[PDB]
Short mmCIF file of C-alpha atoms and ligand atoms in Angstrom, two decimals:
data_model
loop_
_atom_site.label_atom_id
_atom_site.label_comp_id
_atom_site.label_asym_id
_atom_site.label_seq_id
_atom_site.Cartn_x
_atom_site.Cartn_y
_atom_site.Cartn_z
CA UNK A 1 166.56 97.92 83.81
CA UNK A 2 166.85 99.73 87.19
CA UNK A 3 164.92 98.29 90.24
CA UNK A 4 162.90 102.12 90.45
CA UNK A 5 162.08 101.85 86.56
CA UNK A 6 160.58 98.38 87.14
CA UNK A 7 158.51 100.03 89.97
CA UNK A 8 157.27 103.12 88.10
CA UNK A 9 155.97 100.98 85.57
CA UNK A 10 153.88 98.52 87.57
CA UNK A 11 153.06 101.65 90.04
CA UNK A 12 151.64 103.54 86.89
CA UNK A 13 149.58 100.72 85.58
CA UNK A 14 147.78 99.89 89.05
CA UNK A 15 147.63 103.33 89.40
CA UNK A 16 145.37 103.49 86.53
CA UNK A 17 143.92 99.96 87.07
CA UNK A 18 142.81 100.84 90.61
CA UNK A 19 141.58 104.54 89.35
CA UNK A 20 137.91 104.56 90.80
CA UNK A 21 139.17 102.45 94.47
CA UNK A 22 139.41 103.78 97.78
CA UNK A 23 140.46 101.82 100.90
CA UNK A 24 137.23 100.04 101.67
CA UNK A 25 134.95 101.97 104.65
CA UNK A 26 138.25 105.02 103.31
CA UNK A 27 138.16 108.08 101.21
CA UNK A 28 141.90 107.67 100.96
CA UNK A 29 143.07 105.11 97.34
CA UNK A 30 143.40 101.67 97.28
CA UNK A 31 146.89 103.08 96.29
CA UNK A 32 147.92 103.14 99.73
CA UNK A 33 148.01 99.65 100.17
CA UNK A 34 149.91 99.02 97.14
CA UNK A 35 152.37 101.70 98.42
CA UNK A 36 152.70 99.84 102.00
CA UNK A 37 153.09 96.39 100.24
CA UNK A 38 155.68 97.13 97.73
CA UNK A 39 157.84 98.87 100.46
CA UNK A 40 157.53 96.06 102.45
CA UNK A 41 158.72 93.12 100.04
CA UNK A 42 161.98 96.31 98.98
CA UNK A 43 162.29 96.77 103.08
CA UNK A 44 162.71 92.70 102.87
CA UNK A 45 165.29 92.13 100.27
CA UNK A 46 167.46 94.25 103.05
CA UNK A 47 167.15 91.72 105.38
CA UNK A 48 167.94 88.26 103.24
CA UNK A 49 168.48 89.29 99.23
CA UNK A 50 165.39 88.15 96.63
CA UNK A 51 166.45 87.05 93.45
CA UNK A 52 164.36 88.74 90.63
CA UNK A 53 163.89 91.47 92.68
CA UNK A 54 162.20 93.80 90.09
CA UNK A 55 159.66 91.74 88.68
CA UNK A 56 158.72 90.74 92.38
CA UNK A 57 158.22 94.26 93.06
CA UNK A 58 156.05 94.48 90.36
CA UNK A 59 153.82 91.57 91.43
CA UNK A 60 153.50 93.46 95.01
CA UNK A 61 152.21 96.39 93.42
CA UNK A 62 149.90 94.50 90.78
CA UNK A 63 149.13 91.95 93.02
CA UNK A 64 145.23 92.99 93.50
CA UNK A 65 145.25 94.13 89.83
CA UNK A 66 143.03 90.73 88.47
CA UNK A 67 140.67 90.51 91.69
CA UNK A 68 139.58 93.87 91.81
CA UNK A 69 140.12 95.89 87.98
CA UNK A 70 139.19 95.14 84.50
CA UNK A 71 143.07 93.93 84.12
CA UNK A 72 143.49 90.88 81.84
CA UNK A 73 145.89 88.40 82.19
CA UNK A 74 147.02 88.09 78.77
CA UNK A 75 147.60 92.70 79.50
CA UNK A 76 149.81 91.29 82.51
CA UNK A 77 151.97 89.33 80.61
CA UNK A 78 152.62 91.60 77.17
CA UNK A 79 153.53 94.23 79.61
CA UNK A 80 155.73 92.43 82.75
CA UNK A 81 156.05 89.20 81.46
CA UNK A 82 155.36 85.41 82.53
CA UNK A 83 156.66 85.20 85.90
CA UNK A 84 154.85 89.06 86.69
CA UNK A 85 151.21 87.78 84.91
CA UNK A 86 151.83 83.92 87.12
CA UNK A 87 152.33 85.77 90.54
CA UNK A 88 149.41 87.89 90.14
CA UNK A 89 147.50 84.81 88.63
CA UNK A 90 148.69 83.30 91.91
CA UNK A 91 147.84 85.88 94.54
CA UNK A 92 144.44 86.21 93.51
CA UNK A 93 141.21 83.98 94.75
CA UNK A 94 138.96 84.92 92.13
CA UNK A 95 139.24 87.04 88.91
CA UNK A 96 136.25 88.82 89.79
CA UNK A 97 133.59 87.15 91.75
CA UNK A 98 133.98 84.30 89.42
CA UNK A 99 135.57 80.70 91.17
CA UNK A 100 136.63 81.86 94.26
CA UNK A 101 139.38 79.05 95.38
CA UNK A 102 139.17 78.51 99.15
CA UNK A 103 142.17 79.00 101.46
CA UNK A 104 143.77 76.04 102.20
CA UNK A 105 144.38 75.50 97.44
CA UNK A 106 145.18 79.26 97.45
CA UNK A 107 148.11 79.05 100.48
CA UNK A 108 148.98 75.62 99.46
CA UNK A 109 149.36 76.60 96.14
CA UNK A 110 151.38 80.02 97.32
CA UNK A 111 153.74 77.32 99.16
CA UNK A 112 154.40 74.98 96.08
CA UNK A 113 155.31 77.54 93.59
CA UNK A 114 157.75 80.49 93.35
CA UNK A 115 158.76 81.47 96.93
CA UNK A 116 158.66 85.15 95.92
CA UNK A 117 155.08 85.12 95.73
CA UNK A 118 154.52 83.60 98.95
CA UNK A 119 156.97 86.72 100.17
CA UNK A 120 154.49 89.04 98.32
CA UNK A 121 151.29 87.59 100.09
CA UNK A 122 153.75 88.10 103.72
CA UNK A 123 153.83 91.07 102.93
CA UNK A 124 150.18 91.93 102.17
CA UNK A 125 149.38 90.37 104.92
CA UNK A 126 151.84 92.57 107.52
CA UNK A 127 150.23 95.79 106.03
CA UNK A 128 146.74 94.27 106.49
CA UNK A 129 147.76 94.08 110.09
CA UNK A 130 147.32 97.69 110.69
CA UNK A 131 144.76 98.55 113.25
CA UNK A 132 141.07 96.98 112.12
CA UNK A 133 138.34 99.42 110.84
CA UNK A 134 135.85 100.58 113.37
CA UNK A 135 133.42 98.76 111.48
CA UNK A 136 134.53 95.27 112.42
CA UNK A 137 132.73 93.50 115.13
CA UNK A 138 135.12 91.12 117.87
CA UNK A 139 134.79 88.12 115.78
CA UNK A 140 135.36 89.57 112.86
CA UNK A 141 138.53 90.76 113.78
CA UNK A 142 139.43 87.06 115.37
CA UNK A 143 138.65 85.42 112.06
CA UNK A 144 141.36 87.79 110.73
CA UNK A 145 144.08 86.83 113.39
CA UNK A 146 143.28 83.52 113.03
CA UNK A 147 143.86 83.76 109.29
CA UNK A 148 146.85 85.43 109.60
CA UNK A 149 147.96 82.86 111.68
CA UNK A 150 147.33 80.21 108.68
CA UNK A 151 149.46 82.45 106.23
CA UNK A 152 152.18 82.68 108.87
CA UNK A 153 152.32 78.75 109.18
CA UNK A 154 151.59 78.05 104.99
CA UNK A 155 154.16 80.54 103.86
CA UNK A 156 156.60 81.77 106.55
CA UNK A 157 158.75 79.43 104.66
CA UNK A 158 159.63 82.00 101.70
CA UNK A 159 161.93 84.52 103.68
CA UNK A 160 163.25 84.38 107.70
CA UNK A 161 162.97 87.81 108.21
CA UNK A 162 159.69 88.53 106.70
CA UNK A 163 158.14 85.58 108.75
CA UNK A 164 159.32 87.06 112.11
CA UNK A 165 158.40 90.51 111.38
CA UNK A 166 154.54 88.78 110.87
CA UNK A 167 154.93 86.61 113.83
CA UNK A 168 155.77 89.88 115.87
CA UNK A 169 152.27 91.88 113.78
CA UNK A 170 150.36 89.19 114.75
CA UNK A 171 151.24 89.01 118.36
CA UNK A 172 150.38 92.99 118.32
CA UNK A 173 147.29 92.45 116.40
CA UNK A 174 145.87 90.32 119.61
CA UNK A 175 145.13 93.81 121.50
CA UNK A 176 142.74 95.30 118.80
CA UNK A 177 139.98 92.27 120.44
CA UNK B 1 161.54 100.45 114.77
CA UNK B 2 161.42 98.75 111.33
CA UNK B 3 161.99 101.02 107.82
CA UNK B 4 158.35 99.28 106.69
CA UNK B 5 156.91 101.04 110.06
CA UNK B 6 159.09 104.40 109.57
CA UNK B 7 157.14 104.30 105.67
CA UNK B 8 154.14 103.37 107.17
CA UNK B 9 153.59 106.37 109.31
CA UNK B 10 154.84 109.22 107.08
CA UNK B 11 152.65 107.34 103.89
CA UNK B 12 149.36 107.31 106.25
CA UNK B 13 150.20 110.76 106.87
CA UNK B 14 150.89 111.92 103.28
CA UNK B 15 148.02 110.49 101.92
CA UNK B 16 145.26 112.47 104.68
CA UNK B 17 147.08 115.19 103.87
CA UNK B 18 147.23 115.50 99.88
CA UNK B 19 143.52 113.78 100.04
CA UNK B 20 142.16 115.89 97.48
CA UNK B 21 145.68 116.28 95.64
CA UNK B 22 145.99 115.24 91.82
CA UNK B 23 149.03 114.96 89.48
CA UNK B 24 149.31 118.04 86.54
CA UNK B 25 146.61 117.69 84.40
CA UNK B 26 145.76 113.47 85.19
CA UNK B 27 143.04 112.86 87.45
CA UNK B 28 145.26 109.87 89.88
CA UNK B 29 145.88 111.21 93.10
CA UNK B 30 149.04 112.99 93.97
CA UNK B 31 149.91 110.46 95.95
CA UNK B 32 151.55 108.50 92.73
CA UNK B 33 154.02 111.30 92.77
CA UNK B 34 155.57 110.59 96.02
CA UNK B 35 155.35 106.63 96.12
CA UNK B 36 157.24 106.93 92.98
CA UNK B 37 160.13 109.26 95.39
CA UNK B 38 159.92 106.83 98.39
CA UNK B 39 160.76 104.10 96.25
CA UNK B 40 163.54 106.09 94.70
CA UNK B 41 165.10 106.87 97.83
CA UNK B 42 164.98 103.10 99.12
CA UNK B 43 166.05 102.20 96.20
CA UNK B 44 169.10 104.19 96.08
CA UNK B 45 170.13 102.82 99.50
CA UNK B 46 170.79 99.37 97.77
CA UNK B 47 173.56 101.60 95.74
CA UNK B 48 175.40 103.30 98.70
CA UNK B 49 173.75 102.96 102.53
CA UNK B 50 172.47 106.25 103.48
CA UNK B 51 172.72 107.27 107.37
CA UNK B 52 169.14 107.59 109.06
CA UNK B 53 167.96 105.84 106.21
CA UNK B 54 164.12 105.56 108.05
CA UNK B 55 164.04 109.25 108.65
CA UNK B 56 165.11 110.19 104.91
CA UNK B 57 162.48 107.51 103.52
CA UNK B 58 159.79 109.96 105.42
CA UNK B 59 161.30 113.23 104.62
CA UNK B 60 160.86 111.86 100.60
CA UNK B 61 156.93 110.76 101.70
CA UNK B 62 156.26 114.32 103.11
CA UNK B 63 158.58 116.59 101.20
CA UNK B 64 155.50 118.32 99.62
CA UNK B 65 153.24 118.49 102.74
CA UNK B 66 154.62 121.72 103.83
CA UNK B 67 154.43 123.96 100.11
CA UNK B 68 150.85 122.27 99.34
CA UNK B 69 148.66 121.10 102.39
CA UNK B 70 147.68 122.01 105.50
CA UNK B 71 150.49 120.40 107.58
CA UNK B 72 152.42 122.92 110.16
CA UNK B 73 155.92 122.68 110.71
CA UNK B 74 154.69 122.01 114.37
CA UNK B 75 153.11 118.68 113.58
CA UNK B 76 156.02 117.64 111.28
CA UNK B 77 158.39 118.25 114.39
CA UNK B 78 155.80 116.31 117.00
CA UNK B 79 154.87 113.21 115.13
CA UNK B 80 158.29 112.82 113.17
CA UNK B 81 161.11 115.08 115.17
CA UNK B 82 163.15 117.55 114.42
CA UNK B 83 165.48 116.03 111.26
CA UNK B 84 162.38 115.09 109.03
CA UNK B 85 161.19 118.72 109.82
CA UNK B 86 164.00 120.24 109.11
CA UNK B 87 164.17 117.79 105.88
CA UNK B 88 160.37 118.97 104.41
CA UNK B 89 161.43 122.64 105.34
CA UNK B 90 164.55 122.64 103.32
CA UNK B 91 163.32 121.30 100.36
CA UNK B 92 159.82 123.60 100.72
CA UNK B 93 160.35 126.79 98.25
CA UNK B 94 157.58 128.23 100.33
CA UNK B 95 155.78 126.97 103.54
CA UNK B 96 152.07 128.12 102.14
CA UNK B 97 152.34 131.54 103.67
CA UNK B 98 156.09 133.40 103.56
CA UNK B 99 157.96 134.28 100.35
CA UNK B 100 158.98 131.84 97.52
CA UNK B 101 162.90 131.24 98.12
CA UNK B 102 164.49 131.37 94.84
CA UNK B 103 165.88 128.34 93.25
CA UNK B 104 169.62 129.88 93.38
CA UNK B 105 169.19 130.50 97.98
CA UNK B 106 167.11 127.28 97.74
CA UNK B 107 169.82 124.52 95.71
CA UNK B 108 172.57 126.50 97.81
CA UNK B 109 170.78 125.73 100.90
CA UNK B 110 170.42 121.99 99.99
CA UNK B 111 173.89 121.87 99.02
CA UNK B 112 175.20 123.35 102.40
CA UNK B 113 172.90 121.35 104.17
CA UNK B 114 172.25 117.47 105.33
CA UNK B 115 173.27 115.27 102.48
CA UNK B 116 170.35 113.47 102.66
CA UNK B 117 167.91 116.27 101.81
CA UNK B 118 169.80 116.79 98.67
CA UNK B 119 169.51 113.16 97.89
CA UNK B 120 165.59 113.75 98.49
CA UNK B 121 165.80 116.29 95.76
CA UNK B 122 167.86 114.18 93.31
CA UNK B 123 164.91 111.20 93.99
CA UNK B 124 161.86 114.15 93.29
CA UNK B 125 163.10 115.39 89.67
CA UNK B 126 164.33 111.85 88.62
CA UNK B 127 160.68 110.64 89.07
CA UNK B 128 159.64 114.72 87.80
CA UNK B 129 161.84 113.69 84.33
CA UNK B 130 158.98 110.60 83.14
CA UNK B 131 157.52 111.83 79.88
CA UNK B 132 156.39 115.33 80.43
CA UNK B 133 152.41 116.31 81.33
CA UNK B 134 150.54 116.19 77.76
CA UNK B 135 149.90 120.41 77.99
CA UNK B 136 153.05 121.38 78.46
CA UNK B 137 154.87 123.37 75.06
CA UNK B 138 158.57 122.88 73.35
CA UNK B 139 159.82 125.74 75.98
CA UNK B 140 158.32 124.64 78.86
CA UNK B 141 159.56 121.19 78.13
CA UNK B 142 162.98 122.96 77.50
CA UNK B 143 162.94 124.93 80.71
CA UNK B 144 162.00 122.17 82.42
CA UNK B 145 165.16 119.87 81.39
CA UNK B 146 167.24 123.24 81.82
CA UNK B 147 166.41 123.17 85.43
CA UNK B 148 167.06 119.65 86.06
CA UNK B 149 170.50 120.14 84.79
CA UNK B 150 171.25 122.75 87.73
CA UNK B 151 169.60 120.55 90.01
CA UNK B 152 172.52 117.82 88.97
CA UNK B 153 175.31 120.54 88.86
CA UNK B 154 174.30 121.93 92.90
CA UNK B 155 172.60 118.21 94.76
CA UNK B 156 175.01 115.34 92.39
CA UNK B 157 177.71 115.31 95.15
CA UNK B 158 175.05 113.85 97.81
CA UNK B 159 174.73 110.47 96.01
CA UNK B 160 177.01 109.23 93.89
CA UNK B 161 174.47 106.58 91.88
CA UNK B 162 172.07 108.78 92.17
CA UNK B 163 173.76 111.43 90.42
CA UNK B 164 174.69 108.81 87.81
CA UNK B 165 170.63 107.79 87.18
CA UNK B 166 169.43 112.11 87.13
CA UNK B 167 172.43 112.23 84.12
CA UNK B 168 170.87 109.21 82.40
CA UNK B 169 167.06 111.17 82.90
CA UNK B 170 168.16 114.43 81.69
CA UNK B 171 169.85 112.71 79.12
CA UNK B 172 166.52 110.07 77.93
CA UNK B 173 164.57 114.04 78.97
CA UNK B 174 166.15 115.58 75.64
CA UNK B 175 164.06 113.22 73.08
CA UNK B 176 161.13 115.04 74.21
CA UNK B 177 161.40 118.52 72.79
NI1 NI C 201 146.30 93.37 99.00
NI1 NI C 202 157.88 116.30 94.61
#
C-alpha cells in the first residue's frame, strides 16, 4: 500500500473525527495541526529513515483522535491495525476527561515503547512551538517551554534529527516571554 | 530553512485563506483537499528527488488560492517569491477575474513549463480520482475519468512514479461508472 494511500485514509477519518474542532481561541480546524504534524514526522524520515513509515504516519494524523472525538479504540484497530490503535493509545493522557496520567508515566512510557511514537509526540511538540496565543499570560507560556524541555530530554532519544530540530524550536520559543 | 517550516507557512496561509471553503457536497473544510496534495507531492520526492523541493511543497498548499480566494498574485510573489507565484498562476484556469484558459492552452502551458508545476497537477487529480462526490451521474463520472486521462497523456513526463500511481487511479477510477 503506497505511503499517500496510508495517509488519505487516516487524514479522512480524523477529518471526520475532528469535524466540529477548531484550533482552540481559532476559527481555523483542528485539521491544521494534524496537517503540520504529519508533515513533520514525513519531513523526518528524510533526515534518518523510519521503519513502518505508513502506519506511523497514520498515528501522527490520528494521534489526538481518542483525547478529543468519540473515536473508539477497538474503531482504531479494525481500521489501521494494532501498532496504529497502541500509538494513539499511547499518545493520549486521557480518553476523554477520564484518568488523566501525569507527565512523567505518559513520557516515560513514550520512552519504553515503540520509538516511532516518541518521534510522533517530537513532532507534535515542534508544531506546538509556533508562536503562543495572545491569550497566554508570561507564565503560562514558561510552563510550556519548560515542558517542552522535559519532552526534549524523555524522548529526543527516538530520532537525531528530529531532536535537534526541537532543541533549535525551543531555543526560539525563549523570545515569545 | 527546513521543508517542515517551508509547509508551515504556505499551510497557515492556505487555511486563512479557504476559511470558509468546503469539499463538493461534504461539509469538512477544503482544506482536506490540499493536505491530501501536499502529502502527495512529499511523498513523491521519496520516489525521485525533485529540485526546490520546499518551494513545490507550497505551490501544491496554495495551488487553489488564486482561482477560489481572495489571495493576489502580489501577496503570493511577497510572502513566497516569484517561483511559487508563478507555480499557483500556472496551474490557475482563471485568477477570479480574467477569462477561463481552456484545458487544451492550460495542459500545454504546464507541459512547456517548470516540471514541477506539472508534477503539482499530477499530485491534485490523483487525490481528485478517490471515490467520486455522492451527486455526481454515470457521465459526469465518465467525463471526469476522461479528463484525467489527458491530464496523464500532457503532465506524465514530469514524474516518472508519479505518472505510474495517476495510471493505477484512472485505472481503480473505471469501477465507478
Ligand atoms: Ni497534537
Ligand atoms: Ni486542487
Amino acid at each position: 500500500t503506497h505511503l499517500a494511500d496510508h495517509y488519505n485514509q487516516a487524514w479522512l477519518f480524523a477529518a471526520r473525527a475532528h469535524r466540529n474542532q477548531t484550533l482552540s481561541g481559532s476559527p481555523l480546524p483542528y485539521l491544521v495541526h494534524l496537517g503540520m504534524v504529519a508533515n513533520e514526522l514525513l519531513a523526518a524520515d528524510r533526515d534518518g529513515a523510519i521503519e513502518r513509515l505508513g502506519e506511523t504516519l497514520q498515528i501522527a494524523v490520528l494521534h489526538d483522535t481518542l483525547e478529543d472525538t468519540a473515536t473508539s479504540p477497538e474503531e482504531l484497530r479494525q481500521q489501521f491495525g494494532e501498532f496504529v490503535c497502541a500509538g494513539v493509545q499511547a499518545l493520549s493522557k486521557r480518553v476523554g476527561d477520564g484518568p488523566k496520567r501525569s507527565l512523567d508515566d505518559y513520557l516515560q512510557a513514550l520512552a519504553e515503547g515503540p520509538a516511532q511514537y516518541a518521534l510522533v509526540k517530537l513532532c507534535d511538540r515542534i508544531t506546538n512551538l509556533q508562536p503562543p496565543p495572545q491569550t497566554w499570560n508570561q507564565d503560562k507560556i514558561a510552563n510550556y517551554h519548560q515542558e517542552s524541555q522535559l519532552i526534549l530530554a524523555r524522548l529526543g532519544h527516538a530520532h537525531a534529527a528530529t531532536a535537534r530540530r526541537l532543541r533549535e524550536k525551543i531555543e526560539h520559543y525563549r523570545q515569545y516571554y
